[PDB]
Symmetry: D2
Subunit: 124 residues, 4 copies
């Protein structure tokens, strides 16, 4: 049936850098945006809400405003790519991509953030 | 849009008894089973996967073998009801019902388990 | 060797009741209160700091001020007993009794709180 | 009014490096050895049990075989430092320096371990 795959299970990112975490899902022919729903979260906090082809920033959690985006152009190749800028220590943890596309599945990804001491002190 | 609702997001449960935790979803006219997908999990342990009209016990966690049931009758009422038999202390925690039915959503339900000393001491290892 | 000991390391208590958690330490002759130090703590919130007979009220968490006390009567019997009145769901978790009395040791104790749905609903939404 | 004190609350150390976590206490006049118990632990695990001038390594936890040692000549200066060799990701977490010396206190130290991708991938 329908399966979301994560080739990369684990991301190790430096404080302040960028990360793009990815989930694959089968697109047989052209992509039908009307039947596609892509939800991204970490630890119950909403990051991405993609329905009928568009982002909805209504329940996007405070700490991800203007740092996170779904790369709409990857969707046609069957890649839900969540791009996050200016990574913080609070971004470490488990993420989840939930995809509904004539079928539905989700996977998790684990993010680890390395940081020097000054950033680590402020987050303590 | 498509909203999953939970009438109770907190259940309090006596050890060893049975519980049914519920998630409601919109059913327009008559349920189309072909278009319905339901996952029930707790803390990343899969309990139920329901696809194409049947229960998938594929990545089910072993502590839910023969204890966890989805009431199929209630799906046609728009009610994804998870029944868990003989509740144990390890059943305490956060549950997720994930529902795809032309649209998609999920809700969390917290289950608290009360137990007397004898059960609690055995769970203590 | 100085061995702090615990008769129950597991307590199961109902919401709203009172609990007394016991820690025992050897007292061979008469109690020398000047050499006794008792700390009671719950997941790094300090509940009692008892030094040389004086209960330190500098660092008692707001959560336990008004509800926790050390039973001074049992000290010369070799018992450092923490009493918590009107148990709340917040009280559940691992406690430590740390004792310095010519030597030093500590023990952990796990506390589980049962509560009716009504108390559980209050804590779930408003704690 | 004996008080244990730590120069720094937080350590950020690299995987595979060596770490000394420092901890201090009242010793104005010197230097009765026999009134001294030093106990180092990490999240319930015993690392260091110092009494009467020697470590007793019967309670020492298995993950600290050959890697944890107290450096005993600086206690005279009021310094009880725990040395950890070949820092592993397992070593991240909250440490406790417990000292009884005519009085008793203890202080917490948090350790965070940065590691490259290839090190993080095992575990995961
Ligand atoms: C937690 O708030 C969510 C979560 C969403 O996950 C959707 C999702 C996507 C892909 C797949 C799945 C899914 C996976 C496995 C089984 C069943 C379903 C889901 C579960 C989608 C969401 O809005 C589209 C919202 C937010 N709104 C909640 C109610 N209002 C609306 C407009 O809806
Ligand atoms: C948990 O095994 C410990 C823990 C120890 O903490 C020592 C310590 C050091 C300095 C201070 C303190 C302390 C701090 C604040 C207030 C009161 C006391 C402690 C508490 C010291 C220990 O041996 C010196 C041992 C081993 N005890 C052997 C008995 N074994 C059993 C099973 O029964």
């Amino acid at each position: 049936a329908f399966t979301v795959t994560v080739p990369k299970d684990l991301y190790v990112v430096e404080y302040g850098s960028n990360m793009t975490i990815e989930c694959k899902f089968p697109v047989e022919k052209q992509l039908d945006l009307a039947a596609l729903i892509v939800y991204w979260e970490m630890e119950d906090k909403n990051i991405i809400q993609f329905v009928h082809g568009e982002e909805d920033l209504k329940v996007q959690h405070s700490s991800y405003r203007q740092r996170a985006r779904l790369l709409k152009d990857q969707l046609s190749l069957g890649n839900a790519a969540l791009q996050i800028t200016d990574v913080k220590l609070q971004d470490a943890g488990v993420y989840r991509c939930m995809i509904s596309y004539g079928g539905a599945d989700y996977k998790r990804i684990t993010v680890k953030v390395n940081a020097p001491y000054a950033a680590a002190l402020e987050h303590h």
